[PDB]
């Protein structure tokens, strides 16, 4: 294939199989963050080691799909995932049509369910609270603090999540919007005045996952059109990620990242549109829109940052590995 012929025989990876999913229409919010998750490796590993070892589930259909793929015979083509999506709108009734859906909803859906399909397998190990596997690859903690701004009392509470999700500007930039995630915001009861009061709330980073998975907001209503509207902003983000925690923890403030995987959306709004896959492997990057495998130039990323000009081709979900 001409995939293999563009790595070239001396780049391509030992073992490596690069296979494009089947759109079975308006399934590509599905395959684009299915390929993401297959190149985030340590997710890639767990669910392989999860086929090994059991009753029918979401899981068992990603395992015997994400096994298929790294077990193919060829090293380059194109694999139907007929029983995951079918088990999918079987699972969860919202998805169970033809119309376009978004690939966050997905992500987080999927993150959700194989996270307590696992808690609910080792409650049934301890007794024939102890965080999974998933978990381990992606969960990350968040405080909101809340200031009564008559007394200065400050009310923290922790909240774990699976992936982070912040507002689009435009023109700006990955940490521009990480930044704007910790700021102020002001319809309180503090315990301390026990009145009613007015309060700053805020929000911080307290743990950094091993893998960050950043949804970018673009598709917003715009109380102008009484529509949802994709916003195209151009929104900058880096192959590599220096982000730091609230933990205090001196010896750990920090994290490093790189970027492993980008959803991107195609199109002009949240119903018109097309999802598509770009992935790093190895030296390379890839992209996979279904079936079609390609290889691309880390430079033409920046493609995907978006217009500072309707229709355009957007970073919607980052996927950054810690180095850790
Ligand atoms: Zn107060």
Redesign the pocket.
């Known amino acids: 294939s001409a995939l293999e012929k563009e790595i070239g025989p001396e780049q391509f990876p030992v073992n490596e199989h690069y296979f494009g999913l089947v759109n079975f229409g308006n399934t590509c919010y599905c395959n684009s963050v299915l390929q993401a998750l297959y190149f985030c490796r340590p997710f890639r590993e767990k669910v392989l080691a999860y086929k090994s070892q059991k009753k029918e589930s979401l899981l068992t259909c990603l395992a015997d799909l994400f096994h298929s793929i790294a077990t193919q015979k060829k090293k380059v083509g194109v694999i139907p995932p007929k029983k995951f999506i079918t088990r999918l709108r079987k699972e969860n009734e919202l998805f169970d049509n033809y119309m376009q859906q978004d690939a966050h909803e997905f992500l987080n859906y999927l993150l959700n369910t194989i996270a307590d399909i696992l808690q609910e397998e080792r409650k049934q190990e301890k007794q024939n609270p102890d965080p999974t596997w998933v978990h381990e690859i992606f969960q990350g903690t968040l405080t909101n603090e809340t200031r009564?701004l008559?007394?200065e009392?400050i009310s923290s509470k922790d909240e774990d999540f699976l992936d982070l999700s912040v507002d689009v500007e435009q023109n700006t930039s990955i940490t521009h919007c990480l930044r704007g995630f910790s700021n102020t915001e002001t319809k309180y009861y503090?315990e301390?005045?026990r009145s009613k009061?007015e309060a700053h709330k805020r929000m911080k980073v307290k743990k950094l996952p091993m893998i960050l998975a950043l949804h970018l907001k673009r598709f917003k209503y715009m109380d102008q059109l009484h529509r949802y509207t994709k916003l195209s902003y151009r929104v900058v983000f880096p192959l590599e990620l220096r982000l730091f925690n609230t933990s205090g923890d001196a010896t750990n403030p920090d994290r490093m990242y790189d970027l492993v995987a980008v959803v991107v959306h195609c199109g002009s709004g949240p119903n018109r549109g097309h999802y598509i896959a770009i992935v790093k492997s190895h030296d390379f990057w890839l992209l996979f829109d279904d079936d079609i495998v390609e290889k691309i130039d880390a430079q033409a990323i920046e493609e995907f940052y978006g217009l500072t000009s309707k229709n355009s081709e957007s970073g919607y979900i980052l996927f950054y590995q810690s180095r850790d």
Do not use: A, D, R
Request: glycine share 0%; charged share 10%.
């Open positions: 009564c008559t007394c009392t503090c301390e005045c009061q």
